[PDB]
Nucleic acid binder design. Structure first.
Ligand SMILES: [Mg+2]
Ligand SMILES: [Mg+2]
Ligand SMILES: [Mg+2]
Ligand SMILES: [Mg+2]
Ligand SMILES: [Mg+2]
Ligand SMILES: [Mg+2]
Ligand SMILES: [Mg+2]
Ligand SMILES: [Mg+2]
Ligand SMILES: [Mg+2]
Ligand SMILES: [Mg+2]
Ligand SMILES: [Mg+2]
Ligand SMILES: [Mg+2]
Ligand SMILES: [Mg+2]
Ligand SMILES: [Mg+2]
Ligand SMILES: [Mg+2]
Ligand SMILES: [Mg+2]
Ligand SMILES: [Mg+2]
Ligand SMILES: [Mg+2]
Ligand SMILES: [Mg+2]
Ligand SMILES: [Mg+2]
Ligand SMILES: [Mg+2]
Ligand SMILES: [Mg+2]
Ligand SMILES: [Mg+2]
Ligand SMILES: [Mg+2]
Ligand SMILES: [Mg+2]
Ligand SMILES: [Mg+2]
Ligand SMILES: [Mg+2]
Ligand SMILES: [Mg+2]
Ligand SMILES: [Mg+2]
Ligand SMILES: [Mg+2]
Ligand SMILES: [Mg+2]
Ligand SMILES: [Mg+2]
Ligand SMILES: [Mg+2]
Ligand SMILES: [Mg+2]
Ligand SMILES: [Mg+2]
Ligand SMILES: [Mg+2]
Ligand SMILES: [Zn+2]
Lengths: 99, 104, 124, 138, 83, 208
RNA sequence: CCCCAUGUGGACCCGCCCCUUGGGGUGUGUCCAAAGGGCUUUGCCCGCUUCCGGAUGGGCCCGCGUCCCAUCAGCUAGUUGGUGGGGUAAUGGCCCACCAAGGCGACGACGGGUAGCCGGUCUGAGAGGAUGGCCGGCCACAGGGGCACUGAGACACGGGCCCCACUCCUACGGGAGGCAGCAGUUAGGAAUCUUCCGCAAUGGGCGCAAGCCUGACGGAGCGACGCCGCUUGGAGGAAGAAGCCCUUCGGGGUGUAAACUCCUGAACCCGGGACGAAACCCCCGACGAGGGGACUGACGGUACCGGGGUAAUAGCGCCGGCCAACUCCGUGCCAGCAGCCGCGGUAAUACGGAGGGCGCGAGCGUUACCCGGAUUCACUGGGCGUAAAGGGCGUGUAGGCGGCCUGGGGCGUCCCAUGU
């Protein structure tokens, strides 16, 4: 018995928890934003978007999101947002949005 | 080289997709005579351009759907149901030879 | 048949049928004796062929010839079957291997001993 | 219908020679004439010539035989002991230049049809080409 | 990681290696990427070590990492001598 | 173990003389002298028309018992002589005559083929210096086959190399009776051998 | 582990350019870096971050090829396509919502059975048939079923979770396991090995290194299981011992075989004793190139060399024809032989022994199975009046096949080069 490299499992659980936590924050903010753009409220829609953008790229920093996983997230976040903002939007903060 | 094939559109019943019936020939591996088999490919037709009876060139592409890895490269010669006929008439004999039997 | 016919139906390959369901197609099978009867020959031949019903480990119950001048097989004697019919005894498809298990070899066998499983006699 | 013109001709020839006809007619076709050209050159037939039968084109094929013989059955030995069709409709037969057969250990020929024309096995091998294996004569 | 190493090809007591360019993960006697030399441990013949230094240098040119013993043979055929 | 048993009995079965003893097989006693009929209780009875098999069989057995070789080894030589270019028949005989143990016999060192086999075996032989105790060893063209120095003093070797004075040697060989050396010049050809054999039938026998 | 900064750069949105499925460039906006350690310690070493490129390995897609049965003929609803979306490194019904009503099949769908596939291997004149063990390539599985986590990479044999079966511990609540790794045990079977030595060599993981780990591997062990090599002696030696066998009782055979004489001398003894090992490392030199130096073998005191040295295992099948090898005796359709034809009921070359013989020989013979012979599934290379075989006849679908002449095309077909 005892293959002291159980440690691996021991650590997997942590990392699992660390990742899981990053992503849920990500999703929450993503909607949060999409829903603001949704309702047409410009300003704070971008402000939040930028955070989302940030958390995502940081998630890809270590091995949470990592790769193009980050890229997909960001893109599938600026399109939906700018469009939904076509409701008399006018991207104020124009944060993650090359006006 | 992305494989290119030529066949006839035997079906225009789907959206943005067509059924091309590519014919093929070759020598029987043991009896040598030139036999001739054939296969149907579902090709992508975005513009809904190609119509029933068209001869087209199919081109190996990136999957578009399950069972669909070809795009209609181009049209070789329009209209000519004389071919669609064979295909349909053959489908028609199937409508039997089971518990009844295929016409003639 | 026309070439086109050959292309359509083609030749059918022949299927040989075994003549020894010693199952597993094994080379030998061991069974237990049940009856050490003595059948009579067929068509012309006449004599008292020594036979034995055998319960194989292959699940089959068969009849086997017992080669040799004289044997020592009884009711529950363990034996080895080797496959090989006997032209005169309809129903006997295997021979019993002498010199294996409970079947003793033939006594006073000074020739084809390899068969009849008898050790080399020490010439005085 | 006349299913195989080429085979029809080799047979007309095989048939006529077996009864020792001097001549023998076969409906003319460019291709058939091409074959006869070899038959003559290779010395299997005295030769042949265009002719008109009932108004339609034919090719007289002048047959050739050995001399009269001794003993019973003085019938001449044939010059064309053999002549069999090979490639046939619904069983076409083509060969690469490396697969061109060597008929009767060289004493017989084989007529091929190449993109370089109708040639004998030797001719073909020379020109280094292959193609439909029309027939075999010896 | 791509390596330049030996591959047992001899026979019992008659070992004969093949200086090879394989992936670190293969069987030692598995499928290599290219052969670039051979080595006869027992110098049973006057020709007990060929190396085709041309190719080696190419592999090293791109990450090929030689086993120690492989390098020592590559050195012998002056794959490194930069005179 | 190659045969080893009464041998003048083979001489008899083949109804032809076999020099499986070098000497004696001359002195009115090879048995083929006033007794050339096959061995056994039936030898004197009339012989029946042999079957094609019998003939091919007897022919091979001859060619083979001549070199006291096992069918096993014999056969392999044949299948070897069948693949190599050139009239299998002779090519086969060439290889048979290239056996170190045969050569020794051919060069007069030993009186018989058996004897030579032993001389080679017991180390009393050389091949380009290095000693070779393998009777099946195949001698190539351009090889010196000398007697082992340590044995050059052996009674046996001195007698045979003595009587060997004068005795000529095969045109594919040559020997220096001085240093008891000899060379394998070339592979003998069918003509070079006066073998009472018809390889024709030997080839045919392995055809069956 | 996180936040801020620095932005070489890179990612995302939008515009534009070149490209042409999601390839490359560019402008504004946004977004995203890092770790230190060691010394012969002001320099070198190990290492960290972002980007581009190479190299290696891999995912996915496509053409063609890949067993049997039609006493399996119709199969299909995520099923076929579409639009939007999720998920992934990535395409895709892979997954989801909605829409359409498609998709597949006699060129054999669907179903049943069998089977890892290939390089190759066996056989065969070949075509072909059979096969896929050892070795190498790929795939699949890790007591059965399902599932994800962590990671560059796994759905992960010696990691995790649940269910199932089974084994073990249990204070009966609950726990612990998975040799299809090496060796070994047990069961089953006609049948398949040592609980061995070593890390010296090759290879692999971590480490700057020294070095640690390595049942991978290198070896030894057992088993004629296969192949190859070798011995059981060589020369002489009677018109021919004895014994045994046969006989026309004269004699013939075993047989130069033996005995005996001389020669060599496997085993066995004595001494020497190996390659496989050169690196890593140390020293000089820039931790480079190069030079020198040291350490290290399981096998093993084995191979091999030298000296000494004894004539020192032979068996198994067969002898009626196919098929090479014949006599006497015993037996009496018995006892038995037998692959086929067959043999034995008082003269048996066929049963049993003996003598003699033939074959092969540390093997010989049997059983099983594959190819052959079998042109007996016939493409090479067969047939259908009477031997097995023309459909009771017609009409006609699909399909197979197609007169003569010319021109275009060049799909088949043929040639060359090239890549594989
Ligand atoms: Mg939330
Ligand atoms: Mg043969
Ligand atoms: Mg920052
Ligand atoms: Mg520091
Ligand atoms: Mg690449
Ligand atoms: Mg989709
Ligand atoms: Mg299976
Ligand atoms: Mg054949
Ligand atoms: Mg062959
Ligand atoms: Mg083959
Ligand atoms: Mg195969
Ligand atoms: Mg196995
Ligand atoms: Mg198990
Ligand atoms: Mg992950
Ligand atoms: Mg395990
Ligand atoms: Mg058992
Ligand atoms: Mg090691
Ligand atoms: Mg190592
Ligand atoms: Mg003697
Ligand atoms: Mg070391
Ligand atoms: Mg006979
Ligand atoms: Mg018998
Ligand atoms: Mg009697
Ligand atoms: Mg018999
Ligand atoms: Mg008898
Ligand atoms: Mg056949
Ligand atoms: Mg027939
Ligand atoms: Mg009939
Ligand atoms: Mg009729
Ligand atoms: Mg009838
Ligand atoms: Mg009827
Ligand atoms: Mg028709
Ligand atoms: Mg035509
Ligand atoms: Mg047509
Ligand atoms: Mg034309
Ligand atoms: Mg072409
Ligand atoms: Zn003699």
């Amino acid at each position: 018995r005892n293959l002291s490299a159980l440690k691996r499992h021991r650590q997997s659980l942590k990392r699992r928890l660390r990742n899981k936590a990053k992503k849920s924050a990500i999703k929450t903010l993503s909607k949060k934003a999409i829903q603001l753009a949704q309702e047409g409220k410009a300003e704070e829609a971008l402000k939040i978007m930028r955070k989302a953008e940030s958390l995502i790229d940081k998630a890809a920093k270590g091995s949470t999101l990592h790769k193009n996983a980050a890229a997909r997230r960001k893109s599938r976040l600026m399109r939906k947002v700018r469009q939904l903002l076509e409701a008399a939007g006018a991207p104020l903060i124009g944060g993650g949005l090359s006006a | 080289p992305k494989k290119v094939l030529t066949g006839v559109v035997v079906s225009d019943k789907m959206q943005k997709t067509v059924t091309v019936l590519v014919e093929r020939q070759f020598p029987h591996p043991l009896y040598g005579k030139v036999i001739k088999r054939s296969k149907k490919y579902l090709a992508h037709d975005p513009e809904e351009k190609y119509k029933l009876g068209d001869v087209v060139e199919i081109i190996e592409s990136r999957p578009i759907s399950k069972r669909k890895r070809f795009r209609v490269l181009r049209l070789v010669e329009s209209g000519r149901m004389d071919l669609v006929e064979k295909y349909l008439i053959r489908r028609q004999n199937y409508e039997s030879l089971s518990k009844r039997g295929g016409k003639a | 048949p026309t070439i086109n016919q050959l292309v359509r139906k083609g030749r059918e390959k022949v299927r040989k049928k075994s003549k020894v369901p010693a199952l597993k197609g094994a080379p030998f099978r061991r069974g237990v004796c049940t009856v050490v009867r003595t059948v009579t020959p067929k068509k012309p031949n006449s004599a008292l062929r020594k036979v034995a019903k055998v319960r194989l480990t292959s699940g089959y119950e068969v009849t086997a010839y017992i080669p040799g001048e004289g044997h020592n097989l009884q009711e529950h004697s363990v034996v080895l079957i080797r496959g090989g019919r006997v032209k005169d005894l309809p129903g006997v498809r295997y021979h019993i291997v002498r010199g294996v298990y409970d079947a003793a070899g033939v006594k006073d066998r000074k020739k084809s001993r390899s068969k009849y499983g008898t050790k080399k006699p020490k010439e005085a | 219908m006349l299913t195989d013109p080429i085979a029809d001709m080799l047979t007309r020839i095989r048939n006529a020679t077996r009864v020792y006809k001097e001549s023998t007619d076969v409906p003319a076709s460019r291709f058939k004439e091409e074959i006869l050209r070899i038959l003559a050159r290779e010395g299997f037939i005295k030769g042949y010539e265009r002719v008109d039968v009932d108004g339609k084109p034919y090719l007289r094929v002048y047959l050739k035989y050995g001399p009269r013989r001794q003993g019973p059955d003085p019938r001449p030995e044939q010059v064309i002991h053999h002549i069999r069709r090979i490639s046939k409709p619904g069983r076409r037969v083509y060969v690469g230049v490396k697969e061109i057969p060597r008929v009767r250990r060289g004493l017989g020929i084989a007529i091929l049809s190449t993109s370089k024309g109708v040639l004998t096995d030797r001719e073909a091998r020379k020109l280094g080409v292959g193609g439909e294996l029309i027939c075999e004569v010896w | 990681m791509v390596k330049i190493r030996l591959a047992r090809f001899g026979s019992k007591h008659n070992p004969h290696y093949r200086i090879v360019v394989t992936d670190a993960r293969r069987k030692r006697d598995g499928k290599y990427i290219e052969k670039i030399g051979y080595y006869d441990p027992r110098k049973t013949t006057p020709d007990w070590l060929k190396v085709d230094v041309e190719r080696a240098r190419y592999w090293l040119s791109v990450g090929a990492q030689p086993t120690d013993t492989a390098r020592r043979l590559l050195r012998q055929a002056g794959v490194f001598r930069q005179e | 173990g190659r045969y080893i048993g009464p041998v003048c009995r083979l001489c008899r079965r083949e109804g032809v003389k076999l020099y499986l003893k070098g000497e004696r097989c001359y002195s009115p006693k090879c048995a083929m002298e006033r007794r050339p009929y096959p061995p056994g209780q039936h030898g004197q009875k009339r012989a029946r028309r042999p079957s094609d098999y019998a003939v091919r069989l007897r022919e091979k057995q001859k060619l083979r018992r001549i070199y006291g070789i096992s069918e096993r080894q014999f056969r392999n030589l044949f299948e070897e002589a069948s693949k190599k270019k050139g009239v299998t028949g002779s090519v086969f005989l060439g290889l048979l005559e290239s056996r170190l143990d045969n050569v020794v016999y051919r060069l007069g060192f030993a009186v018989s083929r058996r004897q030579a086999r032993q001389l080679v075996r017991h180390g009393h032989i050389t091949v380009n210096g290095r000693r070779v105790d393998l009777p099946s060893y195949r001698v190539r063209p351009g090889d010196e086959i000398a007697v082992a120095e340590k044995s050059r003093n052996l009674e046996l070797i001195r007698q045979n190399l003595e009587a060997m004075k004068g005795r000529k040697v095969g045109p594919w060989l040559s020997l220096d009776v001085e240093g008891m050396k000899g060379k394998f010049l070339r592979l003998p050809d069918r003509e070079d051998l006066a073998l009472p054999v018809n390889e024709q039938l030997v080839i045919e026998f392995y055809s069956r």
